[PDB]
Design a protein around this nucleic acid. Structure first.
Lengths: 126, 100, 82, 208, 99, 103, 155
RNA sequence: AUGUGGAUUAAUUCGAUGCAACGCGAAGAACCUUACCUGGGUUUGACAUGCACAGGACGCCGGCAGAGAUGUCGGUUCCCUUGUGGCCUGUGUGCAGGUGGUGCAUGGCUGUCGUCAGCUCGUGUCGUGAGAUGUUGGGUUAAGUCCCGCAACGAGCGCAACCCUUGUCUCAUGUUGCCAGCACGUUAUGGUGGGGACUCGUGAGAGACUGCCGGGGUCAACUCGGAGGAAGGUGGGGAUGACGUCAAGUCAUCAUGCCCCUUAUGUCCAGGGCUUCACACAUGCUACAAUGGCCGGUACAAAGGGCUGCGAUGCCGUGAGGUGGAGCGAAUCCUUUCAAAGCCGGUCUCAGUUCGGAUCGGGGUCUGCAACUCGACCCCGUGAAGUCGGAGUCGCUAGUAAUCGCAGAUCAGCAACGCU
C-alpha cells in the first residue's frame, strides 16, 4: 500500500494517495469544510500545482497534533513524498523549488532570568 | 533556623498527629451536613476549647537538616540550598543537570 | 466574611462571661483581649475594651454595630500627618 | 560558581551515584535516614578518615558501605566499634545493616583521603609549603596520577588574609567529559580559623 | 488464558534493561510464555533551583529525576513459574509492582 | 528646573543629626549652579563599622541623571566632610568632561 | 552585519493572482500576527476597488505605486556642528518598502469608521493623484531639492 | 499589581545598592513565619548531655483559675533482678543556647567584567637588574583555530569536540496508546476482538567529513558556485565561567576564628506590625477601540499535577458553590473524547461610547479554631482617570519580535498580573 508521513512542529499527518480524482477527505470532512484559509490552501495544493496533476490523485488524511498551519505544511510535505513514491523521476525538479524538506525550525526553549525566548527584561539604568 | 523553633514545630506535629486523628475531625464531619446540631451544638464553641495548636495552619515544611522555613521542596523534603548541595555531591538517585 | 453554615464567631471567654453577667443582671466595664470576636445585639448593655498593641481602649455599644468585629472600633495605627 | 564540581557534572555519565535505591513515598524518609546515618558516623569516628560512604535499600535489607585505607583504627578489632556502629544504625533503624567495610587500593590517588591527610597536617601546627609539595610528589610518583591540582586556601600560615595559592602538575582538563575525575572538598580547623582545600585528580579517559 | 503483569520502575536505563533481560530469561527458564519490555513512556519530575544564597535570582539551575518504566506481561502463569518469579534476586536500584 | 533637582537622601545605618541634610542640599545646589541637564541626584551615607579600619570609615556614592549619559562619582573618607567635598570634586570632574564634550 | 549580509527571504506569492507585491502589502499591514484577518481585509478592499472602478485592483495599485514610489531621498549624518542631510538614490526594494509603509500608515489616520474604507479610498487617492501619500512623497522630493548642495560627500 | 527610597511610627525585623538592586534573600508575611513592639511568666530554661544526692514510677486521658504561657484534683503508678538501669521529679555543679558584632578575621556558595579570547610554565638566549623572547611580521579565523619565514624550541588551563534536546532514516519493540486491511456494539465514542502496516512512545547505530566537482588561493591553509541530502559549511538552540579584580554579596541558608548576654540582647506566651503615606523611584499589566465590545454555533496543540488526595457524571443553584462518589499511585482514571485566538450569522456604527474598569454601598461562597488592620471568588447597582504620550531611553536579525491561552514547583487560600 501507499503510505507516507508529514511532520511540522508537532503536527503529524498520515496520507493515502490513490490514482483516482483529486478527492480530498480529512477526518470525516474536506478541504472546503476545514481550512477557511486560502494561503493554507495554496500550501496544501502546491505539490499537485507543481506537477500539474491537480485532480489526478485522491488524498485521504488523519490530522493530529499542532495547529492549522503546522498541519498544512505537514500535509503538503506528505503529499509530495507520496508523489515521489508514485514516481521519483520528478523529484530533482521538485528540489528546484524544494517542496520536499521537513521544516527544521521548531519552537525554542524558554530561558531563565528572562521573560521569554529572547525578549530580555528592560535593562533599566535607574 | 533555631533549635527552639525546630523543637516547637516538632511539638506541633505531635499535637496534630494526636488530635486531628479523630478529635478535631468528628466536629467537622457532623457540622458539614445541614442536619447538624449547630442550632444547639456548641461544637464550634467546643473546638474553641481545644488548643489553637490543634489546627494545622500553624505548621510549616522546614528542612530536616537546617530548618530553613522557606524554599522547601516536598518531593526532596528539603531546603533548596541543601537540594543543590546534595545533587552537587551526586547523592540522590538519577538526578542530574539536564537541558531541552 | 464569616460563612453562614458555620454561623457566628462568638468566642467562649466573653460569651460565657456575659452569660455570667446577664445572669447577675448587672452591667459594668469589662475588658477582653479578642479583636476576632463577632458582635451580637446582646452587647448593647455592656461596655467592652480591647488592647491594640500599646494599651487598652473602651468602647460603648450601639444597635447598628452588629455583625462586626471589635477591632473595627480600635485605632490600630496613628497617622496625624507629616 | 566559577567551577562546578566535576563529580556533580559528570554524574550523568562517568561518575556514579553514592546512594542507590528506588522510592516513591519513602524518598524523603530515606534521605533523612541517610543524613542522620552519615552524621552519626562522622560524629562517632573521626580519627581515621572515611574515604567513601555508600548506601543501598531493598525490600527489607540495607547495605551501607564505608571505604577507608586504615580499617583497624576505624573498626572494632574484636568487633567493638563495628557493633557500636550497628547499634547507632539500629537506633536510626535501618533494620538489616550488612555493613561491608572496605579498604581502598591507592591512598595517594584517593582525592578525599589525600586532602584530609594534608588538612590534618595543617591543623596540627604545620606550614603548607612542604605538605603541598610532598603531596604532589607522593601522588605523582604512583602510576595513575596523570594530572593533579591541589588548591589550598585560608589564613595560610596565619597570614591574616584571604589567600589562594595552588600547586599542580600534569594534565587537568576538567572539560574532557569522557575521563574519570575525582574531586574532594575538605575544610580543616586551625588556631586562627578554618581553611579550605580542593583537589582534582585526572585519570586517563574512558572508552565505552 | 491468564496474565500476570509486572511494572518495573527504576532510574538507571542500563540497569532497567539489564533486569528486563534477566527477568525475561527467568520467565523463559520454565518454557513459560514471555513477551518483552514494551517501550512505554517515562515520567520526568523536574525541579528548578536558584544557586546562591541571599540574592542573584537571575542565576538558576535545573534538575530532572526521570522514572524509567517497563511493562512485562507474562502469559501462561504456571504456578510453579509464578512462585519462582516471586523469588528473583536483584540489586537495590530497581523496584517492581507485581500485579 | 532649579527646585526640580530631585534630591535623594539616604543612609542605611548612621547617626544623622540634621546638618548632613543642610551640608548636602547646599553642596548639591553648588553644582546645580552650572549644569542645566539634571533631574536626579542619589546621595548615600554608608559605614563599614569594622574594628581597625583601613582608613575608610565613611563611604559615599553619588549618581546623577543626564540627557543620555549619566554621571557617576564615588568617594571614601573618615567622616562626612572630606568625603562629600571629594565626591563633589569628582562630580565636577565628570561634569567638566561632559560639558567640554558637549559642543 | 560587520561580516556581510544574509540573503533576503524566500517570499511567498499571492495565492489568488500571482503578484508578490500583494503579500508584501499584507505582511506590512499585518498586526499582531493576524495574517488571515489582514488578508480578508485585503481581499475586501481590493474587491471594493474592482467594483468601484471596473478594473483589476492590482493594476490600479501599481498605478498608485508608480505615483508615490520615489527615486531620491534623504540620509542624515552629524558633521561639524550642524548635522547634514544628504541626497541618496534609493534602490527598488527600499523604494517599495517605504511607499507601502507611507500608504498603510496614512490610511490608518483617516475618518471612514472602518479600515476597509480608509485603506481602499486612500488607495484610490494615491492612484488618481490626490492622497496624503503623494503629499509626503512631494515633501521628500522637495527636501532633496533643498539639500542638493551637499551631495558632493558621495555617501 | 507588586519591590524599594524618605517621613510617620510604640513596632514599621534584618540584609542586598549603576553596569552586575529593587516583582532581591520570598518558592506564597493574617496566628504561625518573625527575627520587631505593649503586657505577662521563665530562668541550668523551649529541647539535651557529664556528675553525684535525694526518686520509683513518669506520662497521657477529662475537670477547674486563666487572652495563652503557666500552677491544680479524677484515672496510668513499669520492666529489670540485687548490682543497678529505660525513664522521667528535683539540686546544683560542667552548662546549654543567640536572627548579638566583625562577610575588611575565614572557609564554603554565588554574580560580575565575560562565554570576551586569551592568561601562564619549562628549560634556554638576551638584559647588571626590573623584565623581554616565545605570544613579533604576512595570509587566515567565530577565537593564541591554522599555514608560511625568524632565539626560540615545547606544553598546559582555554576555543573546538565525546553530554542532553530537537532535525532524518533501517530492523525489531505492541499497551495504559495507534488502529490503514477485517467482523461485531450503535448513541458518545476504537467502544470489542483483531494488524504492528503507517503513526508511535524507548533504546542502538548510519547521516556533515569542505564528503567529491572544477576556477581561484606562499598551492598551504582560506575561500567561490555545485551535486546529493532531512540537514552543508562551527543544522539550530542548550549545558559548560581561562587567571583574577570589584577587600562584590551572604557572620541572618549553612560552617566558623575572635568580642559580648546570661537573670538575660536568651526564653515561653496571647495582642499588634512588617500592607502606616502630603510624595518619590522602578518593574508590568489592564486601556485610550470597529483588526474592536456582546449573545449564540462549529475543530484541532503541546503539556504536565495527584492518596488520609485529584475529583467525574445526575440534580439543585444566576454563579462562584454542593451531599455524593464512579475511576484513579495513574500513555487509561479527575483531568469536558483538553482550551483562546480564528471561522460562520447578526447587532453596536466612531462616540468618554455596549470602550475602559477603578471606587464604593450592599447580597453571598469556600478553607482555616479565627476573614477588623488583613484573605481570594461570584452576583446586583456602582461607572472614575484615560481621546496614543516630553525632552531621552529600553528589547529585539526567524520560527525571532508582537499577541491568545494553557500547565505547574512553592501553596490549606490567597496580593501569582511574578517565577518557571
Amino acid at each position: 500500500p501507499i503510505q507516507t508521513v508529514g511532520r511540522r512542529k508537532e503536527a503529524v499527518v498520515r496520507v493515502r494517495l490513490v490514482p483516482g480524482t483529486g478527492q480530498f477527505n480529512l477526518d470525516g470532512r474536506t478541504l472546503e469544510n476545514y481550512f477557511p484559509n486560502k494561503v493554507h490552501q495554496q500550501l496544501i495544493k502546491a505539490p499537485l500545482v507543481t506537477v500539474d496533476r491537480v485532480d489526478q490523485f485522491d488524498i485521504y488524511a488523519h490530522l493530529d497534533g499542532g495547529g492549522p498551519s503546522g498541519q498544512a505544511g505537514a500535509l503538503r510535505l506528505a503529499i509530495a513524498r507520496a508523489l515521489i513514491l508514485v514516481q521519483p523521476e520528478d523529484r530533482p525538479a521538485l528540489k528546484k523549488a524544494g517542496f520536499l524538506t521537513r521544516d527544521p525550525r521548531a519552537i525554542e526553549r524558554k530561558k531563565y532570568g528572562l521573560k521569554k525566548a529572547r525578549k530580555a527584561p528592560q535593562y533599566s539604568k535607574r | 533556623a533555631k533549635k527552639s523553633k525546630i523543637v516547637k514545630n516538632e511539638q506541633r506535629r505531635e499535637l496534630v498527629q494526636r488530635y486531628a486523628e479523630r478529635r478535631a475531625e468528628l466536629k467537622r464531619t457532623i457540622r458539614d451536613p445541614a442536619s447538624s446540631p449547630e442550632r444547639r451544638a456548641a461544637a464550634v464553641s467546643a473546638l474553641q476549647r481545644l488548643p489553637r495548636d490543634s489546627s494545622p495552619v500553624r505548621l510549616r515544611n522546614r528542612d530536616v537538616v537546617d530548618g530553613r522555613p522557606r524554599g522547601h521542596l516536598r518531593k526532596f523534603g528539603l531546603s533548596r540550598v541543601r537540594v543543590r548541595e546534595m545533587a552537587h555531591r551526586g547523592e540522590l538517585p538519577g538526578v542530574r543537570k539536564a537541558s531541552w | 466574611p464569616r460563612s453562614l453554615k458555620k454561623g457566628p464567631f462568638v468566642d467562649d471567654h466573653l460569651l460565657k462571661k456575659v452569660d455570667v453577667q446577664n445572669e447577675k443582671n448587672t452591667k459594668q466595664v469589662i475588658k477582653t483581649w479578642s479583636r476576632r470576636s463577632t458582635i451580637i445585639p446582646d452587647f448593647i448593655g455592656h461596655t467592652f475594651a480591647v488592647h491594640d498593641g500599646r494599651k487598652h481602649v473602651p468602647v460603648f455599644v450601639t444597635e447598628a454595630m452588629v455583625g462586626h468585629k471589635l477591632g473595627e472600633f480600635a485605632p490600630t495605627r496613628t497617622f496625624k500627618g507629616h | 560558581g566559577q567551577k562546578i564540581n566535576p563529580h556533580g557534572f559528570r554524574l550523568g555519565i562517568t561518575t556514579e551515584w553514592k546512594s542507590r535505591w528506588y522510592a516513591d513515598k519513602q524518598y524523603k524518609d530515606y534521605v533523612k535516614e541517610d543524613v542522620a546515618i552519615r552524621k552519626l558516623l562522622a560524629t562517632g569516628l573521626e580519627r581515621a578518615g572515611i574515604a567513601d560512604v555508600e548506601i543501598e535499600r531493598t525490600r527489607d535489607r540495607v547495605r551501607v558501605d564505608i571505604h577507608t585505607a586504615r580499617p583497624g583504627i576505624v573498626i572494632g578489632r574484636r568487633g567493638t566499634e563495628a557493633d557500636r556502629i550497628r547499634a547507632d544504625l539500629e537506633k536510626l533503624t535501618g533494620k538489616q545493616v550488612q555493613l561491608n567495610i572496605l579498604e581502598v587500593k591507592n591512598p595517594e590517588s584517593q582525592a578525599q583521603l589525600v586532602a584530609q591527610g594534608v588538612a590534618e597536617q595543617l591543623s596540627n601546627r604545620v606550614a603548607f609549603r612542604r605538605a603541598m609539595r610532598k603531596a604532589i610528589q607522593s601522588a605523582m610518583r604512583q602510576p595513575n596520577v596523570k594530572g593533579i591540582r591541589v588548591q589550598c586556601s585560608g589564613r595560610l600560615g596565619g597570614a591574616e588574609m584571604s589567600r589562594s595559592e595552588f600547586y599542580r602538575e600534569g594534565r587537568v582538563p576538567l572539560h574532557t567529559l569522557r575521563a574519570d575525575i575525582d574531586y574532594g572538598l575538605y575544610e580543616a580547623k586551625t588556631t586562627f580559623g578554618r581553611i579550605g582545600v580542593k583537589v582534582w585528580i585526572y585519570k586517563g579517559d574512558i572508552v565505552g | 488464558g491468564q496474565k500476570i503483569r509486572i511494572r518495573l520502575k527504576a532510574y538507571d536505563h542500563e540497569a532497567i534493561d539489564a533486569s528486563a533481560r534477566k527477568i525475561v530469561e527467568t520467565v523463559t527458564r520454565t518454557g513459560a510464555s514471555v513477551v518483552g519490555p514494551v517501550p512505554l513512556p517515562t515520567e520526568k519530575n523536574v525541579y528548578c533551583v536558584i544557586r546562591s544564597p541571599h540574592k542573584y535570582k537571575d542565576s538558576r539551575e535545573h534538575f530532572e529525576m526521570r522514572t524509567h518504566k517497563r511493562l512485562i506481561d507474562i502469559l501462561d502463569p504456571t504456578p510453579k513459574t509464578v512462585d519462582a518469579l516471586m523469588r528473583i534476586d536483584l540489586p537495590a536500584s530497581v523496584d517492581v509492582n507485581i500485579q | 528646573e532649579r527646585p526640580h533637582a530631585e534630591v535623594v537622601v539616604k543612609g542605611r545605618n548612621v547617626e544623622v543629626p540634621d546638618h548632613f541634610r543642610t551640608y548636602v542640599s547646599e553642596k548639591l545646589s553648588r553644582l546645580e549652579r552650572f549644569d542645566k541637564t539634571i533631574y536626579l541626584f542619589d546621595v548615600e551615607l554608608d559605614h563599614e563599622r569594622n574594628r581597625r579600619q583601613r582608613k575608610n570609615c565613611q563611604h559615599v556614592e553619588i549618581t546623577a541623571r543626564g540627557r543620555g549619559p549619566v554621571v557617576r562619582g564615588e568617594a571614601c573618607a573618615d567622616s562626612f566632610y572630606t568625603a562629600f567635598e571629594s565626591a563633589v570634586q569628582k562630580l565636577e570632574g565628570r561634569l567638566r568632561r561632559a560639558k567640554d564634550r558637549r559642543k | 552585519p560587520r561580516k556581510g549580509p544574509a540573503p533576503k527571504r524566500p517570499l511567498v506569492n499571492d495565492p489568488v493572482y500571482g503578484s508578490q507585491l500583494v503579500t508584501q502589502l499584507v505582511n506590512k499591514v499585518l498586526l499582531e500576527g493576524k495574517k488571515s484577518l489582514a488578508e480578508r481585509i485585503v481581499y475586501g478592499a481590493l474587491e471594493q476597488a474592482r467594483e468601484k472602478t471596473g478594473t483589476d485592483p492590482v493594476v490600479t495599485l501599481k498605478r498608485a505605486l508608480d505615483n508615490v514610489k520615489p527615486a531620491l531621498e534623504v540620509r542624515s549624518r552629524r558633521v561639524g556642528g550642524a548635522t547634514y542631510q544628504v541626497p541618496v538614490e534609493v534602490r527598488p526594494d527600499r523604494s517599495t518598502t517605504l511607499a507601502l509603509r507611507w500608504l498603510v500608515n496614512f490610511s490608518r489616520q483617516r475618518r471612514e469608521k472602518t479600515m476597509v474604507e480608509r485603506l481602499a479610498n486612500e488607495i484610490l487617492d494615491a492612484s488618481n493623484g490626490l492622497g496624503a501619500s503623494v503629499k509626503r512623497r512631494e515633501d521628500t522630493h522637495k527636501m532633496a531639492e533643498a539639500n542638493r548642495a551637499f551631495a558632493h560627500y558621495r555617501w
